[PDB]
Structure formats: C-alpha cells, structure tokens
Chains A and B, each alone.
Chain A
Amino acid sequence: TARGTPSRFLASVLHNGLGRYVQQLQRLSFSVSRDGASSRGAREFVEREVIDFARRNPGVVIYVNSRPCCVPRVVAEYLNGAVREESIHCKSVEEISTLVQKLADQSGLDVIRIRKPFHTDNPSIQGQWHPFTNKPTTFRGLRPREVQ
C-alpha cells in the first residue's frame, strides 16, 4: 500500500546519462558452500558464468568466499552507498544469472513507489502559467472602477 510505505521521485545518482554512462554496481560478494544442496546453483554459477560476468563488466569487483552456509547469498554494493543482499538459496544457474544481471542493471536507488514517472528540471520553456498570462492590460494600468 502506498499510504503504508515510503515514496520518492524519479532521479539519477550523479546525472548518469548526461555525460558518460557509468555502471552503478560496485561490488558483488558471493557466499557459497563447498558442500550443501542449497549452494549447487551457486556452485555451478561460480564454475561457469562468474568468470564471463567479471570479464564482461570490469567496473564491478566480485568476491567469492566459499564458506559453510545453509543459505548462499549475494550482496550487491552500489556507488551511492546502497547495500542490497539477495538469497540464491536453491536457485538454478539461469535464475542466478538473471539475478546478477538484474543487479548489475539497477542503480542503488530504493525500489519504492516512484511518484510521477518523469523528472524534468526545466518543465517550462515559454514561461509557467500565472493568473496574468492570457490577460490583457489596460491604459495607465487602471483597475476596474477607477477615476484617474
């Protein structure tokens, strides 16, 4: 519910698309288990697709810890200080690949209600409307029922 949740306006981080686009994803940290049925998708993701992902985008630092865990996880850290943690528990390799690509695609801004899906900083070019726009003037600026 919108009345029961926060909200924000549509925005960029540092005017991303104005000059050069920069990848907002900074780090991906993977907790995967040596043994354990829940870390099998993560195990094969590390086997095959983590190297190609790192080669594909070199602005992201990827760590893989390989520690005993019941729930494998991925923590995404973004240039604006945002931290997001996701569970890759009992997920297929395609699911994990879609998840990490989505993480690399998003920015660090909060995923909440967006409030008017456009952000213009110069909404008016010919001048914002005021009650005197589209209103003609009078001689000597004489208001109604005046004398001189």
Chain B
Amino acid sequence: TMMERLHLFPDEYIPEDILKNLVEELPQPRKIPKRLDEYTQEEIDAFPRLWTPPEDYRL
C-alpha cells in the first residue's frame, strides 16, 4: 500500500492531475557541487591565487 502511494517519473514530465495534487515540494538532500563554468566571475576575483607560476612554462 505504501508503494501504491508512490509515484515515480524519469524526467520533468508529470501528469496534470498529479501536478494539481502536488503540495509542499521537499528540498533536495545533496547540494549540487557547482561545476566550474557557472561561477559568476565576481567569485573568481574573490578567490585568491595560491601560487605564481614561472613565466617560461608551457603547461
């Protein structure tokens, strides 16, 4: 019975009746570790440079 009261969907699509039934979305437990490209360059400028590299290096 508890599993009959459970509804799973693999994507963003949800049926309209269930959506009209929805209340009080729960918050996500994990924190989405925020990959490099979405970092609001102000934050990059805030973060310090830990080491000065040699000028004669190729990487």
Chain A positions near chain B (C-beta within 8 angstroms): 135, 143-145
Looking at chain A's contact residues, is the secondary structure mostly helix, strand, loop, or mixed? loop
Interface of chain B: mostly helix, strand, loop or mixed: loop
Q: Which residues of A contact B19 (CB under 8 A)?
A: 145
State in angstroms the CA–CA spacing of A135 and B24 once bound together: 9
Given A143-B20, A144-B24, A145-B25, 9 further pairs, Cβ under 8 A: A135-B24, A143-B22, A143-B23, A144-B22, A144-B23, A144-B25, A145-B14, A145-B19, A145-B22
Question: Which range holds the interface residue count of chain B?
Answer: under 10
Which residues of chain B are within 8 angstroms of A143 by Cβ–Cβ distance?
20, 22-23
* Ranked 7 nearest A-B pairs via Cβ: A144-B25, A144-B22, A143-B22, A145-B19, A143-B23, A145-B22, A135-B24
Cα A114 to Cα B23 with chains together (Å): 41
How far apart sit A144 and B21, CA to CA, in the bound complex (Å)? 9
Interface hits, B1-50 → A, CB 8 Å: 14, 19-20, 22-25
Chain B hits for A135, CB < 8 A: 24
A144 vs B22: C-alpha distance in the bound complex, in angstroms? 6
B25 CB to nearest A CB, Å: 4
Q: Report how far A145 CA is from B24 CA in the complex, Å.
A: 10
A145: B residues at CB distance < 8 A: 14, 19, 22, 25
